[PDB]
Ligand SMILES: O=c1nc[nH]c2ccccc12
């Protein structure tokens with residue numbers, strides 16, 4: 001109930017944070033894993049905003065309040081949590097740095113913020129669950145249920161006293177950035193990804209794709225959002241595998257709830273069906289991850305390292321299926 005707000009100690013502490021020098025080099029790379037640096041995550045976000053958008057893009061005090069209140073409105077769920085938000089924001093930073101001038105200043109600031117905010121107040125339940133069991137959110141938001149909630153949460157935090165990082169935009173640019181953010185967060189609905197990628201593939205292959213066309217820009221940004229949301233599949237294998245344990249911890253808890261309501265969950269959400277996980281992962285990479293990064297690489301060639309890493313992880317799941325897996329820690 002209500003929107004959580006950071007403390008004075010929290011945001012003032014962020015303001016004084018300085019990123020260790022060695023990490024400045026590492027943060028630029030697609031495969032960077034934020035995992036080992038938890039105390040530094042808010043600072044890493046400030047650093048990325050400052051590098052992409054400039055140190056004077058946002059008033060520093062409002063930006064630090066905003067970041068620390070965003071962290072406070074992520075729940076302690078296994079996967080859709082603060083760590084995931086910062087991971088997704090980092091992937092976007094890397095895509096933006098490698099493609100910088102294709103995107104306006106307004107788009108870069110909008111997209112980094114959209115990524116940090118894109119799963120705000122996630123409860124560890126899927127759209128499927130909310131709609132199957134008629135949660136009040138599914139009544140309010142008929143499609144893209146949680147994603148409409150995450151956008152609503154973003155706006156609530158911006159409306160907190162001293163948190164509106166966008167207030168200094170002209171009235172026109174302010175409207176435009178909120179629309180960039182809305183569209184980007186909605187695009188993180190994987191249901192919408194399938195159609196979007198298919199459209200982009202056709203536009204690309206026929207040569208009609210045109211980034212001066214707003215609807216085309218919106219779709220390309222959409223695919224960037226999917227690519228950043230899924231980027232656990234682009235890390236080194238041990239990182240990908242550990243993250244998969246977290247994703248499934250969520251899935252299994254939802255499936256347990258469905259059993260209580262008399263419905264057998266899909267095998268993916270069934271903790272009694274863990275043997276099906278490797279084939280499930282193969283299916284996800286073949287149907288979602290590989291096509292995403294394939295199309296993204298066609299449109300934005302500098303993103304190729306994401307595709308290469310995804311392909312490497314696909315091969316790892318294939319090794320699991322063939323029984324070739326080696327020692328793992330969790
Ligand atoms: O939804 C997912 N299902 C399987 N693997 C994933 C990996 C990363 C993000 C989402 C997923």
Ligand code: NI
Nearest residue numbers: 118119146188
């Ligand atoms: Ni989401």
Ligand code: NI
Nearest residue numbers: 084118119229
């Ligand atoms: Ni997400």
